[PDB]
Amino acid sequence: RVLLCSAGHSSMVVPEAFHAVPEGFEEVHVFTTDSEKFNPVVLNDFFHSLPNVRFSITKCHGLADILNERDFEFYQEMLWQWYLTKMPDNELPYVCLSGGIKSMSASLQKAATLFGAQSVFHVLADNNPRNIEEMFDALQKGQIHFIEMGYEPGWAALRRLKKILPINEGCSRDNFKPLISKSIEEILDTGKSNQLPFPSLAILPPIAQQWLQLPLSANDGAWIQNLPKVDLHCHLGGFATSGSLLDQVRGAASEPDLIDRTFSPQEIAGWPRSHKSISLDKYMELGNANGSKLLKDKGCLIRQVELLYQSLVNDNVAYAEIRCSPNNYADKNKNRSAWVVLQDINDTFTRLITEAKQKNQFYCHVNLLVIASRKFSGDLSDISKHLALAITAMQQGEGVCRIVGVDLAGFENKETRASYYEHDFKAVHRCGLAVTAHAGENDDPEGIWQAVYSLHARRLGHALNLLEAPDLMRTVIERKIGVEMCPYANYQIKGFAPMPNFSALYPLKKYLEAGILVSVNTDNIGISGANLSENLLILADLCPGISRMDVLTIIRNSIETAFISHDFRMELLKFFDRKIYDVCLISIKN
Amino acid sequence: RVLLCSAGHSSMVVPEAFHAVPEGFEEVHVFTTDSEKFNPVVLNDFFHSLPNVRFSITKCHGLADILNERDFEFYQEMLWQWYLTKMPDNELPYVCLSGGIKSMSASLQKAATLFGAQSVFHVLADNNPRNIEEMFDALQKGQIHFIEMGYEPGWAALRRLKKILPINEGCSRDNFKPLISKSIEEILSNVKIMASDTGKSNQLPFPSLAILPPIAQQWLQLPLSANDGAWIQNLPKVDLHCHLGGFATNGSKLLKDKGCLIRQVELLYQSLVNDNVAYAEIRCSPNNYADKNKNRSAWVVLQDINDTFTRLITEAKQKNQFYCHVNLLVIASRKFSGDLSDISKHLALAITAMQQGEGVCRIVGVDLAGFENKETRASYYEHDFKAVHRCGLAVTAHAGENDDPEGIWQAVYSLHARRLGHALNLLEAPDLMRTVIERKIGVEMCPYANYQLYPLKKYLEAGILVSVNTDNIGISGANLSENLLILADLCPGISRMDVLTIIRNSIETAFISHDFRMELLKFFDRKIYDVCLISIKN
Ligand SMILES: [Mg+2]
Ligand SMILES: [Mg+2]
Secondary structure, three states: OEEEEOOOOOOOHHHHHOOOOOOOOOEEEEEEEOOOOOOHHHHHHHHHOOOOOEEEEEEEOOOOOOOOHHHHHHHHHHHHHHHHHHOOOOOOOEEEOOOOOHHHHHHHHHHHHHHOEEEEEEEEOOOOOOOHHHHHHHHHOOOOEEEEEEEEOOOOOOOOHHHHOOOOOOOOOOOOOOHHHHHHHOOOOHHHHHOOOOHHHHOOOHHHHHHOOOEOOOOOOHHHHHOOEEEEEEEHHHOOOOHHHHHHHHHOOOOHHHOOOOOOOOOOOOOOOOOOOOOHHHHHHOOOOOOOOOOOOHHHHHHHHHHHHHHHHHOOEEEEEEEEOHHHHOEHHHOEOHHHHHHHHHHHHHHHHHHHHHOOOOOOEEEEEEEEEOOOOOOOHHHHHHHHHHHHHHOOOOOOOOEEEEEEEOOOOOOOOOOOOOOOOOOHHHHOOOEEEOOOOOOOOOHHHHHHHOOOOOEEEOOOOHHHOHHHHHHHHHOOOEEEEOHHHHHHHHOOOOOOOOOOOOOHHHHHHHOOEEEEOOEOHHHHOOOHHHHHHOHHHHOOOOEHHHHHHHHHHHHHOOOOOHHHHHHHHHHHHHHHHHHHHHHHHO | OEEEEEEOOOOOHHHHHHHHOOOOOOEEEEEEEOOOOOOOHHHHHHHHHOOOOEEEEEEEOOOOOOOOHHHHHHHHHHHHHHHHOOOOOOOOOEEEOOOOOHHHHHHHHHHHHHHOOOEEEEEEOOOOOOOHHHHHHHHHHOOOEEEEEEOOOOOOHHHHHHOOOOOOOOOOOOOOOOHHHHHHHHHHHHHHHHHHOOHHHHOOOOOOOOOOOHHHHHHHHOEOOOOOHHHHHHOOEEEEEEEHHHOOOOOOOOOOOOHHHHHHHHHHHHHHHHOOEEEEEEEEOHHHHOEHHHOEOHHHHHHHHHHHHHHHHHHHHHOOOOOOEEEEEEOOOEOOOOOOHHHHHHHHHHHHHHOOOOOOOOEEEEOOOEOOOOOOOHHHHHHHOOOOOOOOOOEOOEOOOOOOHHHHHHHHHOOOOOOOEOOHHHHHOHHHHHHHHHOOOOEEEOHHHHHOOOOHHHHHHHOOOEEEOOEOHHHHOOOHHHHHHHHHHHOOOOEHHHHHHHHHHHHHOOOOOHHHHHHHHHHHHHHHHHHHHHHOOO
16 A cells, blocks of 8 residues: 655654554655655655665655745645655555644645545654654554544546646646636536436535536537437438448448449538538438438348447447338338338347347447328328337337337428328327427427327427427426437538527527426437537537536436336436446546 | 634634635634633634624533544534534635644544535734734734635535534533534445445435435335324425315305405415425315305405415515415316306416416416216316417316226326326226326325225336325315325335335426426425434434
8 A cells, every 4th residue: 555644843753654554554655845844864764674665755846835825836736746646546545644734734635535545544642752762652552543534535536637637746836727726616506406317416526516517618528428328319211321331331232233332422511510501401412322222121221220229339328219211111022011121120129239238238228219201292191001010019019129109200391280190190199109299390389289289299309499489388398398409410400609690599508497308319320420429519519608417417308208118217217327427437537 | 704713722813814805704703622721812802892793712621632532533523513503504604724733724624625615724924923913013014824725615415414413502421422423424335335336326216315324225215114203294295286175174155255265274374384395286166265245256266365375475485484385276166067157267267367477376277176977077178178278277187086097098188187186096007007107197196085905006116106195184184294194004015215206206296387396396305305314313
């Protein structure tokens, strides 16, 4: 073990602390001011009798004693740097405070309680011995007291500053940034006080408990990636659109002869950070290289599903729901019916889940979503076909990758407000499925009312114009209705701050403070060119002033709004709680 | 602003610390041991020179100095106790550390880190001044120096130990108890359990009261005993279903006048506060109480109810004493054939009444109670509810006691009832269980009402947001604390955790605004924390 000490007038308190553990101590490292009242020769001869005990001596060069604010802050930053440098890599260092005047003793105590120490304590003797032949009988008589106030874990993970900040033993106060000063300066609203999800978030030391409340920044990439996230609006057809993913899915086709390798979607400057707003038609056009024209192949379908699952696992996602269009990928020529396609995707996902779980690795439990599209070019019987297919998949029953519900989506040019397609949606609720609705992407605030009150839809897509219907806000809020929303996709197809020639503000922050159960999603990964992590991170320059804890409550809302069973909700909540606790403990160790 | 400092052998710290802040302070408290070396006369006269600010001296009885482990632990306990009796109620205080020898300096810094402080600092003087005039002189020359440390927020949950013991009327060594040691050991054990185990580490399913001692959590996991009556009485509660007219059992025959209604409302409020209930929703019958011959319309009666309730709420709040926010629900008695327009009248009255706006008490929803029958199903009144949801109201229902499961289904889906009354036989339709589960439709079930095997346990296992209510206090002759008490013997194997789950489900199913729900969550969390932390000792 390694012990640390600081003393003033007293010269050999370190030997007194060296008997704190009856077994003994292994390493000794003492840091103190440049005052001459400390005697290094006595400590040297004391520790020379024990060669097996390492004895390293360091002093505050250029500072005999603390006298003013500048001297105090200089000594504080140097002892901080020495403390980060000198602790054991995996063990908390030992430390004692039986010596030194108030300033350095308090500074070392605060540094120890902020980083952590194996045991801080005090050693006092009744007879205040001056020579070793005195403290020998002082400890023999028991006069020396081993004053210990309690174990001090500190922040179990903060020492990343040892590496992210280069170790510089020789330096002055002229160049140092106290990140801790910024993390302490502003700590203490009702919301951030009591919207704490994941009850274990009350357990982290007050440093982390308040750090979670700081505004989110673009430099938060590793931490946001290391969180377990949830995606609820993902289109499988838009996963692979270009690049290595497209090459891999194309090469896995059963018959590569009929693979159109000539088409190539055009580039958008700065994509995904579009230099200007884009229309919906071109947004679908960028996904023309994939979709249904290429995914008819069974091998292509298997490769796409496996690649999507692998990417979802790589993005640290723990639960997801996938929107699929089984009818679009059916082909009667090869006896590839829509039901067969859905069954194959179910078996593939179940096999992937089982093989990931059997190895006790990280896996994202995945459930499907069927798409009852607007059915362009008429032929609305496919709506009933899709509902029947979903119902059959739902009472299929056995398995793990279950179908949870249906999705209604499509173009808003037809002006469908959940009334045209209401004539058949009555039967689905009897079985026990769940209904979403892509409503009001750019339409009037009227259709959503029937979408929630006649369709009984528990989720909404986008609905970015909800801010102008406060009456709709109130009824949405009381009914606990989730709102799926895609940051990058909406930003690209509509335009929001801060790109030039636009004044529209992203309604996310007001949606959160209102209390709408909004869950951030990614829509089409390949076309947008951004995974869940990037979509979450873009909120920094999308909605300024947002804090990490709003992200945490967004994740909690995403858990809440998923069409899943109760017991699975408890288990997933427990796993998310533990994982997120470890993440905020260890990842932000920076 | 409050200054706290330790007194050793010299009067150096206190005046320089008091004048260190340019604005100055208002309350200053200094802690010291039983040592006769220190003198209080200088500080006494200095603070008497400025009597506008407050000052006090606390002496650690029976301890002149620290000479062993027992002496130091006793001093630390009394220092922590003096600190906790001396937090300002809301704001964090300032701390000066330069007093005493390094031992009490470190103890005071530990106290500041543990309980949080506004801005702790150090004070040093080169010339070691002695008497007031030359302290002032040295401060004139700028020899004074304040060494600011930082701003510790501290453990928010650990500022709540003032409730268990402000002071033990000057405890002696014979009856001394290390309560602050209990606090520090509970928090360190919680952190160590978090860091060591994983199975216990991840469960944590509740509002972040995880910071109780592990012994407290183990006691909570234990099943209810019939002797926990004091504990449940002390816990804040919520009564989402209470009928005003059935308290003094009355109603149509007696309450036609005005003074009787006022005294009934006051009695209901007094009884409701008497049980420490923080929130309740009341269903009333304005048409049953109107008197046309006296020019007493139903609207007038409802306005009088709202006015007396909000007046009482304001009166209770002005005293800063514990008060119970109450909202009103307009009943729609299912009178069937008689005066079929009464239903439309009641809903229209509700829409008009909820729009009054100003008033802490308001109308948040309507009720569908009345004579239940197949003809009285939800598919009979549904022509009239196309607009109650349009104006943003809320609807409850009472079905399942003798009705049919498809009636419950249509009530859930046609009326879009946010809540539900009774429906004890919901087990026999697992499909209905799933429908009520995923839609998060609450259930209001009163154990005494059905008492006059109970499946509530199975309801918690499945996941119904079950709320326990009084229905009608008077005819049942029991309050909500009694209702919670019957669950012990009435349902064996019920754990004290499920009582808190019932309370939480009740506060989620209340027809309340988002911000009001947020405030109620915070207040409920603080109150349950305090009450369990107090009651675990006894
Ligand atoms: Mg979409
Ligand atoms: Mg009742």
